[PDB]
């Protein structure tokens, strides 16, 4: 999501002659994402091809994917370079998977990508494989030792048990992933020598994915300070259960309750406080002083006392947080950067217009008819202080 959302890195990774999946978690519409593919295909040199990643998590995205898949359908009906589709966070049911495989863009899909997290999820994909035996299906088996979206399932035991049934389908391409930064450590899974430690006879793999080790890369959009942070983090051997920051890495749960692997060394303030607040919420009112100050430490600022705070302080706080002085929102608008906050600028307007709405005793003729003009209002907007 953060890493591959940039059209620059996924292009550069592909231009290096490598397979990559464009992130869909950073694209909220067909149009905004169609810009990325267009930026991709422009930065895509002749013939080179890439794939796309999608999430199963929420209904709104799955309804957006109906427009998204038809976008992918339209793109490839137009002959778009994107040669694959990646379903994430869950395995679609047979009728849902058949649809994806059999789409008008099917040949341009050329294979389908699934990411099973459990034994049952693996067995589900096997049934998707037997569905269309002539359709290539790349099964990426991840761990919970991996980054981001998490799981309680071991790296080995899952693949150790399900491998035999996975190889009874020729259309299944087995790909092991997670906790791999190097060719040396990942060489044994390729030779099949990795299963020998568990006594099982050799168990070779068809491919390997690297999520984490590519984050510190040059063409990645990761900030200079964030890269240095990922670097100095020391790594670990097989994941341990004991709750702590483990080798600069501690798990944490998202808003939905699912675990997320985040960096607890580079940033120790957000994760641990979150675990404090989460486990502490009954009595929050009692620890309010301790809790409200810690939000300010991680820069999740509450506002100074709500009543007593002057309307300036309100309106000056939004400008403070929304408008960066270094990036110069006015100068940020000119390149037409995707980082543009314009909803935040629109947010501040609705607050400004509310301020006029609150204090005006008269008919509201003079004030409202001015700031609402395009040419006039937009000029007023690029200069927040004025």
């Amino acid at each position: 999501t953060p890493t591959t959302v940039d059209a620059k890195i996924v292009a550069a990774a592909a231009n290096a002659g490598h397979w990559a999946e464009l992130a869909g978690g950073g694209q909220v519409t067909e149009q905004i994402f169609n810009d990325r593919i267009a930026e991709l295909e422009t930065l895509l040199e002749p013939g080179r091809a890439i794939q796309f990643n999608t999430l199963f998590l929420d209904p709104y995205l799955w309804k957006l994917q109906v427009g998204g898949k038809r976008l992918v359908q339209r793109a490839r009906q137009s002959g778009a370079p994107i040669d694959g589709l990646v379903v994430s966070a869950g395995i679609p049911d047979l009728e849902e998977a058949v649809d994806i495989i059999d789409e008008l863009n099917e040949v341009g899909i050329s294979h389908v990508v699934f990411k099973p997290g459990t034994v049952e999820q693996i067995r589900s994909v096997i049934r998707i494989a037997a569905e269309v035996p002539t359709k290539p299906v790349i099964v990426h088996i991840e761990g919970g030792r991996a980054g981001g979206h998490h799981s309680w399932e071991d790296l080995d035991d899952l693949l150790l048990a399900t491998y035999s049934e996975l190889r009874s389908r020729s259309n299944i391409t087995i790909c092991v992933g997670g906790g791999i930064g190097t060719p040396e450590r990942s060489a044994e899974y390729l030779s099949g020598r990795w299963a020998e430690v568990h006594g099982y006879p050799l168990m070779p793999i068809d491919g390997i994915l690297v999520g984490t080790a590519a984050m510190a890369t040059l063409e990645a959009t990761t900030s200079p300070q964030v890269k240095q942070l990922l670097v100095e983090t020391k790594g670990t051997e097989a994941w341990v259960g004991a709750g702590k920051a483990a080798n600069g890495m501690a798990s944490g749960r998202s808003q939905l309750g699912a675990d997320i692997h985040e960096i607890d060394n580079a940033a120790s303030r957000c994760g641990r406080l979150l675990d404090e607040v989460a486990g502490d919420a009954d009595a929050v009112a009692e620890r309010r002083d301790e809790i409200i100050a810690a939000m300010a430490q991680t820069a999740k600022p509450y506002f100074g006392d709500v009543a007593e705070m002057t309307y300036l302080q309100w309106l000056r706080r939004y400008v403070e947080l929304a408008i960066g002085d270094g990036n110069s929102t006015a100068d940020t608008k000119r390149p037409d950067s995707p980082w543009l906050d314009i909803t935040w600028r629109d947010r501040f307007e609705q607050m400004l217009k509310r301020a006029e709405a609150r204090l005006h005793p008269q008919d509201f003729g003079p004030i409202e008819t001015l700031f609402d003009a395009d040419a006039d209002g937009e000029r007023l907007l690029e200069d927040p202080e004025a």
């Binding site: 490598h18 013939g47 091809a49 930064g181 190097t182 690297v210 964030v226 808003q255 957000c270 994760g271």
Partner: protein, 145 residues
């Protein structure tokens, strides 16, 4: 309010990076040392050292490795036609017509099999393939005359 949309601050932000949720994995972090190392370098580093390990023991300076530095191939012109499912026209990608030419053809003909230069694959759909000017592969389809 806390956890929502926390993934974007790691990229292009001047703020203190110790306040941000940034996502590694636990064990993969050990393999992360070099900073601002180009994607092309990391991915090749994987492939190049995987090749060497495979080369040294089993292959021992294989014909495949030697053929590469000397430019020799697998899947020549005749195979490439029957291999790649995608047929490019300009910047657009199309399915290989041979897939629908090979089997569905009533009369299909492969001329001079073992000889590569003279190799020709023709069909009753009136579509024929041959090589011209070295690397250029010539597919010739016809309607009536």
């Amino acid at each position: 309010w806390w956890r929502s949309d926390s993934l974007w601050q790691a990229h292009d932000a001047r703020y203190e990076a110790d306040q941000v949720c940034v996502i590694p994995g636990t064990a993969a972090v050990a393999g992360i040392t070099r900073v601002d190392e180009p994607v092309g370098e990391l991915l090749d580093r994987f492939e190049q050292a995987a090749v060497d390990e495979v080369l040294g023991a089993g292959a021992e300076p294989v014909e495949v490795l030697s053929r590469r530095q000397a430019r020799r191939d697998a899947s020549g012109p005749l195979a490439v036609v029957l291999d790649a499912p995608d047929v490019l026209w300009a910047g657009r990608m199309s399915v290989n017509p041979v897939h629908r030419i090979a089997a569905p053809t009533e009369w299909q003909v492969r001329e001079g099999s073992d000889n590569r230069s003279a190799s020709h694959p023709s069909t009753g759909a009136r579509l024929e393939v041959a090589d011209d000017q070295h690397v250029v592969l010539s597919v010739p389809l016809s309607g009536t005359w």
